Ligand binder design. Structure first.
Ligand SMILES: CCCCCCCCCCCCCCCCCC(=O)OC[C@H](COP(=O)([O-])OCC[N+](C)(C)C)OC(=O)CCCCCCCCCCCCCCCCC
Ligand SMILES: CCCCCCCCCCCCCCCCCC(=O)OC[C@H](COP(=O)([O-])OCC[N+](C)(C)C)OC(=O)CCCCCCCCCCCCCCCCC
Ligand SMILES: CCCCCCCCCCCCCCCCCC(=O)OC[C@H](COP(=O)([O-])OCC[N+](C)(C)C)OC(=O)CCCCCCCCCCCCCCCCC
Ligand SMILES: CCCCCCCCCCCCCCCCCC(=O)OC[C@H](COP(=O)(O)OCCN)OC(=O)CCCCCCCCCCCCCCCCC
Ligand SMILES: CCCCCCCCCCCCCCCCCC(=O)OC[C@H](COP(=O)(O)OCCN)OC(=O)CCCCCCCCCCCCCCCCC
Ligand SMILES: CCCCCCCCCCCCCCCCCC(=O)OC[C@H](COP(=O)(O)OCCN)OC(=O)CCCCCCCCCCCCCCCCC
Ligand SMILES: CCCCCCCCCCCCCCCCCC(=O)OC[C@H](COP(=O)(O)OCCN)OC(=O)CCCCCCCCCCCCCCCCC
Ligand SMILES: CCCCCCCCCCCCCCCCCC(=O)OC[C@H](COP(=O)(O)OCCN)OC(=O)CCCCCCCCCCCCCCCCC
Ligand SMILES: CCCCCCCCCCC1=C(C)C(=O)C(OC)=C(OC)C1=O
Ligand code: SF4
Lengths: 47, 156, 104, 80, 318, 98, 169, 105, 70
């Protein structure tokens, strides 16, 4: 029995599975800039 | 009088603590990095002056620009300078950091790091030797020794 | 009471040194500096929960130097080796189903 | 049983030492002659008070004094 | 009079921490074929004073924080725990002679990771928080073998009392019945304090220690000196725990000189390990814990449970 | 009875009403749940130490171990909710209304 | 004041529960529950539960709240009215309870409660050469066989359960 | 569904932690050992309905042993009357309730 | 050479020597020239409080021997 309040209720999916509704990008530099010091790296990290 | 003597001795104490505990932040841009690495090597050994080797870039006292500053790394140099806590100092090591050097007339090279950061000590050479860079560091300590911070504060 | 005096002294010395290190570098008046979700990892949470579960198993193991003093030593030795064996079986199941991977 | 053991002692000696130490810990008190003495020392440690008995008249194995001969002795604990 | 005893504990702790920096720089100097500081003081003895006055007037760094109150409380908690880990240490008499000093130290060292976690929450970097999480996971990982090795050693003690642990080792050093526990203990205490080869925050293998990065951090000197109080403390605790010395009840200074010399040699052994090995990758010390130390630690835990029963060598409770 | 028992009961009811009135987060719900457990631990320990009832001294250890394992299960549920939605907000967990 | 030390710690315990139960944030909620665990642990330590208090510090605050803060660092993002209002509401209710039980020495919210310090209800005996609480905890192994069986089985099942539900497959 | 498996198999799984008067480690007595033993040996075998009315006195003594509410109420009355007599000036404390008498043993 | 580190190690060793020697001498000063009474168990505290009561001067460390009995 639909009401004014329970009007926005769509019926649930058939297999009860909903659609799930990224990875890290790092700019890198050498830690102590004595050996390399002039290196720049753009990462794409995945954990 | 009395207060002038007190601020004089306090300037002497804080200048002793700052020049005898310098922590350098190195820009290993070019060949002068190799000669700073010889200034930290066991012969010349910056660490026995309290000048530590490979300090944190966050907490550091003197930025040593050791190499060629190109146009692509001038804003990185200035941002690392602006993140340093005061009192920060700049040692310009070698001819390319001093005035462009062997690449002075280049399209891509900043003609001296003094166009970017305020420079305290200019260390000349190509490369200036590890002994000459240590001479520049000791001259920086002499420049820190004759600071009159609290004396000028008391006289302002 | 000696312990509470000692803890109060240690907390007071800690707060005093923190108050120094936050107010002493403000005496030298510097310039006014004007110029200007994290990725979730399942492995970090799994090593944290693995710590928590094995720490509960440690919490079961902690009365052993007192439990050695008992008169029911066969029962006590059996349950002691059984708890350490259950900690080992927990570690073995954490091993062999690839739970300890990339933080091994 | 011989080639697998040498292979796992070459590959994973940490786990071989672990299962060896654990297996000796399991099976060795069942083969030890001194496991009985642990029980005997733990029950002979007097945490409480040895509450005396009312001598009704016939208890020949209960002494009347600590230094009396009858009673559970600890000569084995001194001597071992 | 008791407050005099508390001050004569906690002020020489800070002085020993100050000169551990000098001893570290000098011993790492001579092990690297160079010298450490010898200009600032006679033989470098005024290097820690100069460096502390330098760090205490250096500007608060560049940025501001996410949580102000935790940014204040993380050095307070770090210094408070680093000073309260010393009070049950028997040397030859502890300050607070408590019946459960071992368990007290293990609990207060379990509390030590909140300084790491609150300094991670306090900085505005979402990457320094990841580094703080990695350091917290490292420390709570090696706390497992700390607890189980400590329990396995105290199975030969009889109690959690630290003062009894001097009585235990009157005939032999306890490193002789328990040297595998001693070597795993020494490496695990080395991995507790984020000390090399396990220092991943102060080194590479790190997503945030990276040259023109963000993250307002606190005054570095306070976390540094809490860390070195932890180092000297865990070496004294290892000395009491395994290499416990002779104690004359009428001459306490014999035991005091003896545990002092052993604790100095063991802290120099920390300095001598950090100047000898490259750093682990993060998964490599996670592997070193969970697949190398913890199986051997559980095996030796079963062994030191069942061993006093099969030898009839159960230590007394009192 | 004992005056401290009033405060530990009132602490359990404070953490109850914190757990019985959600604001936004599931983590705050689990914090209120473990505060309830903490008050249960303290109250059980004060009774058992007060009574000198010896064998129940191991009971608060069993309470702590079982409920911290319960808390680890709750944190794993929170982690799966946060992996689904991005937050741990309770208003994202309303698919089962229909 | 010093005779009422367990009561003062219990009032600080209730104030801490009001502090985090009003829920400003999970971060400050965890902080308030840490401070609450410390002061309730002090309550336990002042009756003679030294092992159980160090179990609070080592296990509760040492493992579980560390894992709660570890997970909170992986859930919320770093950078009111109802929180502060409920905080001062609980503080007013608790200090009215304190004022009533200190002016009347008998109060009845749900049960009757004494107004004197809880030092009166202790025992006037000694235990000998052991802590009774320590021996009762040591009896987990000799007497508590079935208890150790079910607790270790629940922890092993907990390991299996966390590896099953966090796998996502 | 109280399936009494413990009494059927004859095994003891949890009857030992159940009461204070059970076999304790190192024979440690509880503070209400005698009262609980009297209440249990009263109420045994007669069931709950007869135990609520025929063992009321042992149960009241054991509850007042555990909680000490009548004892604390009596001490409240004595302390309140004593403080009222101190306030009215009609009472001075003795030297053995002041700390000036060098206790017995 | 290598002995140049020994002044700093000596200063650190004196700083580690101070707390234990200090607490030993304070425990001898505060307890009548003897060790502090270790009371880990309630029997030891019972005897210690008995000593405090039998000394008469409210101090546990004032020992009464056979001169106190008749
Ligand atoms: C116990 C562990 C170690 C503790 C730390 C070491 C002990 C010594 C600590 C104090 C050192 C001296 C004061 C702080 C340093 C001040 C240096 C400085 O340049 O100050 C400039 C400041 C301001 O100088 P200003 O006004 O010239 O600033 C110029 C800078 N701009 C233009 C950018 C603003 O000096 C002061 O504010 C004076 C503060 C008090 C100085 C001492 C008074 C007497 C105390 C007794
Ligand atoms: C898996 C279970 C392995 C251990 C089984 C019990 C070992 C043991 O010591 O039992 C004797 C112990 C103790 O018996 P006991 O022999 O020490 O009895 C003497 C009496 N007291 C203890 C008061 C001095 O336990 C029992 O008898 C009852 C508990 C275990 C019952 C069986 C559990 C089976 C679980 C299956 C799942
Ligand atoms: C307390 C005083 C000091 C104590 C000693 C410590 C001082 C010396 C320190 C040296 C420097 C160490 C720096 C850090 C090094 C970290 C790396 C490392 O060592 O990793 C550990 C390594 C790790 O292994 P790994 O990485 O070398 O090997 C590779 C492993 N796999 C294949 C899995 C990848 O070894 C261990 O974990 C060993 C731990 C201790 C072993 C104890 C052995 C006991 C044996 C008893 C007999 C067993 C035989 C069988 C049974 C017989 C019964 C009768
Ligand atoms: C009214 C009067 C009082 C007013 C208040 C002031 C109180 C006292 C303040 C400290 C002393 C003030 C004077 C400071 C030094 C002045 C002289 C000086 O600078 O001497 C330089 C000399 C080294 O010469 P240099 O040129 O560096 O050598 C080149 C290499 N051969 O340097 C040396 O030889 C060594 C210099 C050491 C400086 C003093 C020692 C350090 C300070 C100790 C107290 C403060 C620290 C307390 C503890 C901090 C934490 C551990
Ligand atoms: C009986 C007493 C009680 C025994 C239980 C108590 C054990 C205490 C120690 C706790 C150990 C906890 C973890 C145990 C996990 C074992 C399974 C395992 O690790 O299998 C995987 C491993 C190969 O590892 P992999 O998959 O390649 O992973 C990368 C690592 N390099 O595979 C292997 O490495 C193979 C391991 C199995 C073969 C080992 C044989 C050892 C024999 C020793 C001598 C006999 C000792 C008597 C007892 C034997 C018990 C088996
Ligand atoms: C963010 C908040 C602030 C953070 C920084 C400050 C807090 C963290 C660092 C300090 C931690 C304080 C820990 C206090 C309790 C330590 C455990 C303890 O008391 O153990 C010692 C001892 C037990 O051993 P035992 O010998 O059996 O007892 C005496 C019997 N003869 O027991 C005794 O000797 C009992 C002595 C009396 C009871 C002492 C109780 C202290 C007061 C309550 C806790 C106060 C701290 C609250 C915060 C804790 C951390 C969250
Ligand atoms: C009667 C039953 C409640 C008893 C306590 C009442 C205290 C006063 C608060 C009344 C309710 C105010 C309110 O808005 O509560 C809802 C709030 C959660 O909602 P929130 O997201 O914070 O704000 C949006 C508004 N719904 O809810 C909360 O914030 C609840 C926080 C609970 C903490 C309880 C602390 C002790 C309170 C007194 C003892 C009970
Ligand atoms: C458990 C033990 C803990 C010990 C901790 C401390 C360890 C180190 C102890 C000190 C070691 C020796 C210090 C020598 C410092 C250098 C002294 C000196 O020569 O300073 C010269 C400087 C300028 O003097 P000027 O008159 O210009 O000289 C030219 C003359 N033709 O004049 C000056 O700078 C002014 C005088 C400064 C004197 C500073 C002395 C050292 C202060 C260190 C602080 C802590 C001292 C220990 C405190 C506790 C013990 C008392
Ligand atoms: C209260 C006393 C404070 C003393 C502070 C001494 C600081 C140590 C200086 C050298 C140093 C060492 C050894 C050091 O290990 C380190 O970490 C990598 C530094 O930071 C970059 C250092 O600067
Ligand atoms: S000044 Fe010359 S030698 Fe030095 S870094 Fe520049 S190019 Fe190299």
């Amino acid at each position: 029995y639909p009401t004014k309040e329970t009007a926005h209720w769509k019926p649930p999916p058939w297999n009860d599975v909903d659609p799930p509704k990224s990875n890290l990008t790092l700019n890198f530099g050498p830690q102590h800039p004595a050996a390399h010091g002039v290196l720049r790296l753009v990462m794409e990290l995945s954990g | 009088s009395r207060g002038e003597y007190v601020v004089a001795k306090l300037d002497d104490l804080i200048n002793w603590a700052r020049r005898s505990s310098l922590w350098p932040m190195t820009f290993g841009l070019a060949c002068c990095a190799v000669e700073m690495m010889h200034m930290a090597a066991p012969r010349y050994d910056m660490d026995r002056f309290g000048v530590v080797f490979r300090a944190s870039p966050r907490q550091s006292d003197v930025m040593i620009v050791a190499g060629t500053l190109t146009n692509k790394m001038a804003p990185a140099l200035r941002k690392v300078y602006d993140q340093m806590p005061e009192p920060r100092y700049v040692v310009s090591m070698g001819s390319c950091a001093n005035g462009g050097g062997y690449y002075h007339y280049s399209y891509s090279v900043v003609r001296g790091c003094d166009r970017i950061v305020p420079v305290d000590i200019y260390v000349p050479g190509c490369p200036p030797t590890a002994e000459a860079l240590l001479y520049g560091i000791l001259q920086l300590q002499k420049k820190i020794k004759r600071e009159k911070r609290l004396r000028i504060w008391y006289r302002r | 009471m000696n312990l509470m005096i000692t803890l109060l002294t240690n907390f007071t010395l800690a707060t005093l040194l923190v108050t120094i290190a936050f107010w002493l570098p403000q005496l030298n008046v510097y310039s006014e500096k004007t110029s200007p979700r994290l990725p979730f990892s399942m492995k970090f949470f799994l090593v944290a929960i693995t710590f928590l579960l094995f720490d509960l198993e440690i919490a079961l193991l902690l009365p052993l130097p007192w439990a050695s003093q008992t008169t029911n030593l066969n029962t006590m030795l059996t349950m002691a080796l059984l708890l350490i064996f259950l900690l080992a079986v927990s570690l073995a199941y954490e091993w062999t189903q690839k739970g300890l991977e990339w933080t091994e | 049983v011989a080639a697998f053991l040498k292979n796992v002692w070459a590959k994973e000696p940490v786990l071989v030492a672990s299962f060896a130490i654990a297996g000796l810990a399991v099976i060795l008190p069942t083969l030890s002659p001194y496991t009985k003495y642990s029980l005997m020392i733990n029950r002979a440690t007097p945490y409480n008070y040895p509450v005396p008995l009312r001598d009704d008249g016939n208890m020949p194995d209960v002494p009347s004094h600590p230094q009396d001969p009858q009673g559970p002795s600890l000569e084995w604990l001194k001597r071992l | 009079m008791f407050m005099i005893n508390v001050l004569t504990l906690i002020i020489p702790i800070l002085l020993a921490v100050a000169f551990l920096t000098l001893v570290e720089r000098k011993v790492l100097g001579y092990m690297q074929f160079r010298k450490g500081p010898n200009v600032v003081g006679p033989y470098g003895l005024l290097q820690p004073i100069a460096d502390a006055i330098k760090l205490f007037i250096k500007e608060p760094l560049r940025p501001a924080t996410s949580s102000i109150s935790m940014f204040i409380l993380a050095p307070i908690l770090a210094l408070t725990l680093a000073l309260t880990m010393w009070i049950p240490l028997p040397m030859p008499y502890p300050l607070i002679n408590m019946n459960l000093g071992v368990l007290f130290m293990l609990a207060m060292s379990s509390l030590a990771v909140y300084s790491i976690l609150w300094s991670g929450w306090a900085s505005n970097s979402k990457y320094a928080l990841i580094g703080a999480l990695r350091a917290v996971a490292q420390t709570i990982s090696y706390e497992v073998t700390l607890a189980i090795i400590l329990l396995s050693v105290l199975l030969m003690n009889g109690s959690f009392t630290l003062s009894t642990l001097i009585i235990t080792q009157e005939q032999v050093w306890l490193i002789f019945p328990a040297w595998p526990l001693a070597m795993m203990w020494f490496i695990s205490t080395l991995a507790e304090t984020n000390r090399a080869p396990f220092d991943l925050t102060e080194g590479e293998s790190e997503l945030v220690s990276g040259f023109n990065v963000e993250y307002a951090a606190g005054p570095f000197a306070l976390f540094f000196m809490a860390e070195y109080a932890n180092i000297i403390m865990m070496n004294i605790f290892t000395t009491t725990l395994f290499l416990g010395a002779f104690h004359n009840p009428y001459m306490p200074e014999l035991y005091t000189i003896n545990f002092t010399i052993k604790s100095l040699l063991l802290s120099i052994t920390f300095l001598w390990i950090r100047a000898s090995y490259p750093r682990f990758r993060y998964d490599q010390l996670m592997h070193l814990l969970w697949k190398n130390f913890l199986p051997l630690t559980l095996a030796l835990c079963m062994w030191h449970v069942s061993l006093p029963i099969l030898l009839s060598s159960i230590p007394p409770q009192t | 009875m004992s005056l401290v028992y009033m405060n530990i009961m009132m602490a359990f009811t404070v953490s109850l009403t914190g757990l019985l009135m959600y604001r936004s987060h599931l983590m705050s719900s689990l914090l209120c749940l473990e505060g309830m457990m903490l008050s249960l631990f303290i109250l059980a320990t004060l009774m058992i130490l007060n009574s000198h009832f010896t064998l129940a001294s191991m009971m608060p250890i069993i309470l702590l171990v079982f409920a911290a394992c319960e808390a680890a299960l709750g944190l794993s549920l929170l982690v799966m909710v946060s992996n689904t939605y991005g937050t741990d907000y309770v208003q994202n967990l309303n698919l089962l209304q229909c | 004041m010093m005779t009422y030390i367990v009561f003062i710690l219990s009032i600080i315990f209730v104030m801490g529960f009001v502090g985090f139960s009003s829920k400003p944030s999970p971060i400050y909620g965890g902080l308030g529950l840490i401070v609450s665990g410390g002061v309730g642990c002090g309550i336990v330590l002042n009756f003679g539960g030294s092992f159980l208090g160090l179990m609070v510090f080592l296990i509760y605050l040492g493992g579980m709240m560390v894992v709660f803060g570890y997970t909170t660092a992986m859930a919320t993002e770093q950078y009111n009215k109802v929180v502060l209002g409920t905080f001062i509401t609980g503080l007013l209710m608790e200090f009215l309870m304190v004022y009533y039980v200190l002016k009347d020495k008998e109060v009845e919210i749900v049960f009757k409660f004494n107004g004197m310090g809880d030092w009166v209800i202790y025992d006037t005996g000694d235990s000998g050469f052991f802590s009774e609480e320590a021996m009762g905890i040591a009896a987990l192994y000799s007497y508590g066989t079935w208890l150790v069986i079910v607790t270790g089985w629940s922890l092993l099942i907990g390991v299996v359960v966390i590896m099953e539900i966090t796998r996502g497959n | 569904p109280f399936f009494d498996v413990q009494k059927k198999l004859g095994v003891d799984l949890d009857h030992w932690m159940t009461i204070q008067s059970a076999e304790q480690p190192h024979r440690i007595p509880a503070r209400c050992h005698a009262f609980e033993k009297e209440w249990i040996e009263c109420a045994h075998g007669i069931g709950s309905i007869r135990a609520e009315k025929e063992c009321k006195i042992e149960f009241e003594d054991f509850r007042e042993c555990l909680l000490r509410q009548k004892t604390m109420k009596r001490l409240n009355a004595i302390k309140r009357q004593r403080d009222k007599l101190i306030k009215e000036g009609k009472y001075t404390p003795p030297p053995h309730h002041s700390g000036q008498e060098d206790l017995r043993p | 050479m290598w002995f140049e580190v020994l002044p700093g190690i000596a200063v650190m060793g004196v700083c580690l020597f101070i707390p234990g020697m200090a607490t030993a001498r304070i425990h001898r000063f505060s307890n009548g020239g003897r060790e502090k009474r270790v009371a880990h168990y309630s029997y030891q505290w019972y005897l210690m409080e008995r000593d405090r009561r039998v000394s008469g001067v409210n101090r546990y460390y004032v020992s009464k021997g056979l001169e106190n009995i008749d």
